[PDB]
From TrEMBL:
UniProt key word NADP: no
Keywords: Metal-binding, Nucleotide-binding, Zinc
Signal peptide residues on this chain, from the entry's feature table: none
Polymerase/histidinol phosphatase N-terminal domain sequence ranges: 7-72
InterPro entries given in the database record: PHP_dom, PHP_domain, Pol/His_phosphatase_N, Pol/histidinol_Pase-like
Residues that hold Fe(3+) 1 according to the record: H10, H12, E67, D253
Name of this chain's protein: Polymerase/histidinol phosphatase N-terminal domain-containing protein
Annotated PANTHER family: EXONUCLEASE, POLYMERASE_HISTIDINOL PHOSPHATASE N-TERMINAL DOMAIN-CONTAINING PROTEIN
Annotated AMP binding sites: R102, R105, R138, R154, S155, G258
GO molecular function ontology, one term from the record: metal ion binding
Residues that, per the record, bind Fe(3+) 2: E67, H78, H195
Stored SUPFAM superfamilies: PHP domain-like
Amino-acid positions noted as binding Zn(2+) in the UniProt annotation, renumbered to this chain: D17, H42, H255
Length: 286
């Protein structure tokens, strides 16, 4: 029931916490036989112009997107926002605020970690690959610790020092899921709850009631085909999707080398991508 062919609509680049350029994403997605790809960087549209250029030169269809961190009660929620107006003032202000809060938080973490680990702010910035256009975050601390030889992989770092459980962890303030959904729809976009079945990060998943309230706010779909969603959660989420007539998406959550996730390991079917395009803004020329 996971699509054998289609689009990988959940991919990160150097403009957030992936290791590759938008050109590299488009190039590779084409070579892997994908029907298309989405850019889905954290709290930004910075890679959209590079992604679009690459899509036209390489000839691979492209969905323009963003992964937005949100919160709902105690639950941390990630939302994929596709095909919205990137000059929408409200959504740009919100990304700006989120980015600023996450920068302050990351510097406070590095300052704490620096007391115990061979890590400096410059070491973190050496991991930020697009300068002021990169959404800086936890993965850049993890990479700095890998580069300093504290951990083998970024995964190891998240299991320990950079972990939500550790004494160095500071949480980032995030807008509510209701604020994000209203903002994305306002900007003419399509909003999907990303990996809502994934019990890493959270002590608990979103409930049916939280999801119902997100559907009433304007939620368009659920990412079902994702490695973090176990089988029982995929059936739960497919049931909710069928019931409320929601879109069902999939994606690799590729971060290039920064994660084990493989480009195209999970996909959205062509017909669902059709629906995303038709609901979203016509961005041809912008
Ligand atoms: Fe996520
Ligand atoms: Fe992601
Ligand atoms: Zn990420």
């Amino acid at each position: 029931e996971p699509p054998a062919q289609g689009w990988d609509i959940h991919c990160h680049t150097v403009f957030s916490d992936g290791t590759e350029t938008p050109r590299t994403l488009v190039e590779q997605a084409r070579k892997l036989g994908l029907h298309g790809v989405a850019i889905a960087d954290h709290d930004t549209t910075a890679g959209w112009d590079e992604a679009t250029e690459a899509s036209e030169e390489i000839g691979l269809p492209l969905l323009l997107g963003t992964e937005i961190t949100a919160v709902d009660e105690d639950v941390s929620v990630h939302m994929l926002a596709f095909q919205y107006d990137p000059s929408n003032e409200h959504i740009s202000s919100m990304f700006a605020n989120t980015r600023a809060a996450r920068l302050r938080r990351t510097k406070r973490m590095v300052e704490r970690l620096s007391q115990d680990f061979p890590i400096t702010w410059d070491d973190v910035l050496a991991q930020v690959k697009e300068g002021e256009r990169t959404t800086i975050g936890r993965p850049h601390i993890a990479d700095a610790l890998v580069a300093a030889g504290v951990y083998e992989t970024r995964s190891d770092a998240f299991a320990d020092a950079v972990s939500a459980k550790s004494k160095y962890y500071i949480p980032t303030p995030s807008p509510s899921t209701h604020e994000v959904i209203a903002a994305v729809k306002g900007a003419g976009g399509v909003v999907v709850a990303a990996h809502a079945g994934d019990p890493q990060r959270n002590r608990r998943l979103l409930s049916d009631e939280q999801l119902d309230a997100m559907i009433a706010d304007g939620l368009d779909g659920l990412e079902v085909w994702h490695r973090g969603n176990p089988p029982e959660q995929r059936e739960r989420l497919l049931t909710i999707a069928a019931r409320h007539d929601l879109l069902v998406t999939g994606g690799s959550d590729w971060h290039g080398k920064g994660k084990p996730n493989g480009l195209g390991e999970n996909l959205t079917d062509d017909d669902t991508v059709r629906e995303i395009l038709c609901r979203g803004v016509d961005l041809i020329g912008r």
